[PDB]
Amino acid sequence: QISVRGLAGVENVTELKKNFNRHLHFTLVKDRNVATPRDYYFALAHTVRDHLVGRWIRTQQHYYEKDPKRIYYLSLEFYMGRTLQNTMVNLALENACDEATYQLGLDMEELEEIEEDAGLGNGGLGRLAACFLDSMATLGLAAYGYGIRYEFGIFNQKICGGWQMEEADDWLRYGNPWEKARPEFTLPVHFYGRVEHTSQGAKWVDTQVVLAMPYDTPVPGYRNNVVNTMRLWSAKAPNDFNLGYIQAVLDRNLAENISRVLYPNDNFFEGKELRLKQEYFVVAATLQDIIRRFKSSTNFDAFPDKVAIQLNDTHPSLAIPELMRVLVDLERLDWDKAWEVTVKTCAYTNHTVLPEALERWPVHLLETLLPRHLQIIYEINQRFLNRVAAAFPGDVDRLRRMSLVEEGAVKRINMAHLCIAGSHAVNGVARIHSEILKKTIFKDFYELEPHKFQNKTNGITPRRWLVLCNPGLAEIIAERIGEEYISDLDQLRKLLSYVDDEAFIRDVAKVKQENKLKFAAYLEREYKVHINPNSLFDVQVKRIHEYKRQLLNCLHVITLYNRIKKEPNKFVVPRTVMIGGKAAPGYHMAKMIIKLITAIGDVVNHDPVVGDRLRVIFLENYRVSLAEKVIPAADLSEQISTAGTEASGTGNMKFMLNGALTIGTMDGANVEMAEEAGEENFFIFGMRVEDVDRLDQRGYNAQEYYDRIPELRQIIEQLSSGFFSPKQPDLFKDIVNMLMHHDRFKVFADYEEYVKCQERVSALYKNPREWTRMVIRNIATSGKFSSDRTIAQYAREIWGVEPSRQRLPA
């Protein structure tokens, strides 16, 4: 139907049709008379998977022969979403599969909606790892993603009586056709035990053993016939485990719980033993695999020439002392040489400066679970602090600040400090964030070793986040500038020569309108809600958090409502305000914010005086598959975190690529997006980082803003008095108390500038032609935010390997 979806040749369609029928019969054991849509989905997935196999085997054989430097991306999270459409896109099979299923009497889009998201992450950090895997394959890098195969991913969110309820995400119930179990490559992982010191070194003995069984998932590059691997470990008890008899077998669950569930906290550290077990499990199993592959390529001097390990935050930080343990205790390298190898192999990416998100593990947990690792960490610390002392003699406070061991009531290990000491490179994820690291939390480290610190601004894959989710936009672009931009997104700059082209303006606007109609329909059918498709679609989708300031959005919505009620017969630009995101189950304030948003909806959406001028919708169960629907439909992207708190953001980039304008603070990558597009084509408001620092030095007093801004006082009085909760008038007192007396994120300080900036948005939306011209200027300068650009920078500046667009033969 559309060009970018590839060719539908007769021979190819014929072959797909017969393989579909073959799988339905032999694989699924069904005939057409009793087959359901689910069976049809599975038959199509198996048919598409068959096309990955030859490329997968040949890619991995190619790495074996050529022996390139291998890149290992370690993460506790991979937020993959659905795989079927992505696979078709990357192998150029979408139009052929569409035609094949059409001829069989099936709608392929209907079949696509049956697939479960692979939800093995919380949000941005997990989704970054997934875009990175897509880019590494597209750039021909010999790359492996290593993680945990959680039985249960991020919970499914239900809203009941306006409140979040959680349900287990049993994503594997119907089977996962994309993974291949590899029980033959199962490896042992050790826990507990004790250290014995002998004549020939330390020995870690009396341990409990858990097995790590790998499942491999293919990761296709974009039309280059490269298929890399994501290897996810599953925990298994050994067969003699605990071996009355029945209890012993049932107690195998204690070992197997390690891979049962994803911790569901975004940007929040919870120091639980089970989480520490998960972190060591992935690290221990992965490093054995790395070393095996390296020996099957004595001379560990070449290890850093053949291996790069990238740590996605500190969560796999135990890779550093585990590598030292293997090299020292098992391979019998001297300490200094092992440390040299480790440092040159490891690199660390930091994704946050929020104190509560930083990993600081109690010494007593490490002492019990990983006694040899604690010893190694102590030794790392002593050697590091001897370097600090030599560089900064007499500076005793620096020694305390830089230590990997934090003193106090309970001693803890600072994992970020460990990562910096043991990595040859440390990066932040946007320019402003990387600057903050050098000026604030990692200042002392930067002074000691300035050469270690880098920036790598984040990106997103334009396969999933344009071609897959917005084929209509992708097509009208390819009509003008060809298809090369899909793997070289900087080519979107050529669209600037169309900003005055009347045909292009019309088409860009038509595609948004079509996306908005489709989304409005999806709402009605799947959630029985009726939105005005001519209204401005104002969207804030992301995890619920105080720092992301969904609360500031709420204050604006209430302001708009109150202004309408004051002057009902005055014209205002109609808005549909959509907010979605999951709250961590234990995060009380985030749960209260969800309830506030639905309560505002309950009042606003049923007030006859408002009509269809203002609607507020809470989008339930926000996840990767829902992002693919709502992002192409958005007009306005809300990116309104307190300056200094969002390390980068990536949702921001997805909206930019899909034809929404951004209202935002100068935070994370928003700064670079405004720089690329031009500040005139961005709706920037609020305190900069320097202004936040100034307020903090003076002392933030929320009462001042309440006292001076009548519209803000009205809202707080409505909240406190029970206007949005008539049957429970004190329901939102926690929210009010926080706003007035202990708001770390300064919601009131940005309120006036936010409201005024939102008026400017509404004014521009009244002029469709000029709205759309600004959109074209955003889409055209979105090229920098391709994760292909990001990964090429890691490759050249950290990993020491050259990217390639050259195709392997099929």
Ligand X SMILES: OC[C@H]1O[C@@H](c2ncc(-c3ccc4ccccc4c3)[nH]2)[C@H](O)[C@@H](O)[C@@H]1O
Round to whole Å and give the CA distance between 564 and 558.
10
Q: Does 441 bind ligand X (CB under 6 A)?
A: no
Check: CB of residue 621 under 8 Å from CB of residue 156: yes
Footprint (CB under 8 A) of a second copy, residues 160-189:
165-168, 170, 173-175, 180-181, 183-184
Burial (CB < 10 A; 0-12, 13-18, 19+), residue 190, is middle
From 254-262, 324-332, 334-342, 646-654, give the range in contact with ligand X by CB under 6 A.
646-654
- Residue 669 CA to its chain's centroid (Å): 15
Residue 595, annotated as binding a ligand = no
In the complex, least distance from residue 315 CB atom to a second copy, rounded to whole angstroms: 16
Phi, psi of 534 (to 5 degrees): -85, -10
Question: Which residue, 602 or 797, has its beta carbon nearer to ligand X?
Answer: 797
d(CA 767, CA 227): 47
* Closest distance to ligand PLP from the beta carbon of 154 (Å): 9
Residue choice 44, 418, 584, 624 for contact with ligand PLP (CB under 6 A): 624
Catalytic positions are 351, 542-543, 548, 650, 654
Q: How far is CA 706 from CA 642, 736, 739, in A?
A: 19, 12, 10
In the complex, the smallest distance separating the C-beta of residue 409 from a second copy, rounded to whole angstroms, is: 24
647 binds, among ligand X, a second copy, ligand PLP, none (CB under 5 to 8 A by kind): ligand X
Rounded to the nearest whole angstrom, what is the least distance from the CB of residue 590 to ligand X in the complex? 14
Strand partners of residue 413: 361, 405
Residue 511 zone, left/alpha/beta (φ > 0; ψ -120 to 50; rest) = alpha
Q: How far is the CB of 458 from ligand PLP (least distance, A)?
A: 9
CA distances from 747 to 464, 587, 594, 692, 703 (A): 34, 19, 17, 11, 12
> Which residue, 428 or 651, has its beta carbon nearer to ligand PLP?
651
Consult the annotation and say whether 794 binds a ligand.
no
Residues 30, 785: Cα–Cα separation, whole Å: 45
Q: Contact at 8 Å (CB) between 141 and 132?
A: no
Site for ligand PLP in 636-665 (CB under 6 A): 649-651, 654
User: Cα separation of 804 and 378, whole Å?
Assistant: 42
Binding flag, residue 627, ligand PLP (CB under 6 A): yes
Tell me the closest approach of the beta carbon of residue 267 to ligand X, in angstroms: 5
Asked if 423 contacts 311 with a C-beta cutoff of 8 angstroms, the reply is yes
* Partner whose footprint covers residue 623, from ligand X, ligand PLP, a second copy, none (CB < 5 to 8 Å by kind): ligand PLP
64 is in an annotated binding site: yes
293 in a known ligand binding site: yes
**Residue 580 found at the interface with ligand PLP (CB under 6 A):** no
> CB neighbours of 85 closer than 8 A, spacing ≥ 6?
94, 112, 468
Among residue numbers 134 through 163, which ones bind ligand PLP (CB under 6 A)?
none
Indicate whether 37 belongs to the interface with a second copy (CB under 8 A).
no
Tell the smallest beta-carbon distance from residue 29 to a second copy (Å): 5
Pairwise CA distance, residues 281 & 794, whole Å? 26
* Residue closer to a second copy, measured from CB, 252 or 306: 252
CA diameter of the chain: 90
As a whole number of Å, the CA-based R_g of the chain is 27
Q: What are phi and psi of 214, to 5 degrees?
A: -85, 145
Number of residues that bind ligand X (CB under 6 A): 21
Give dist(CA 376, CA 382) in Å, integer.
10
124 binds ligand PLP per the rule CB under 6 A? yes
Which residue in 72, 73, 132, 241 binds a second copy (CB under 8 A)? 241
Binding-site positions for AMP read: 31, 64, 292-297
- Which residues would be at the binding site for a second copy (CB under 8 A)? 25-26, 29-31, 36, 38, 50, 53-54, 56-57, 61, 152, 155-156, 165-168, 170, 173-175, 180-181, 183-184, 236-237, 239-241, 243-246, 249-250, 252-253, 257, 260-261, 263-264, 272, 274, 585-586
List contacts with ligand PLP (CB under 6 A).
123-124, 127, 542, 623-624, 627, 649-651, 654
Residue ranges of the binding site: 31, 64, 292-297
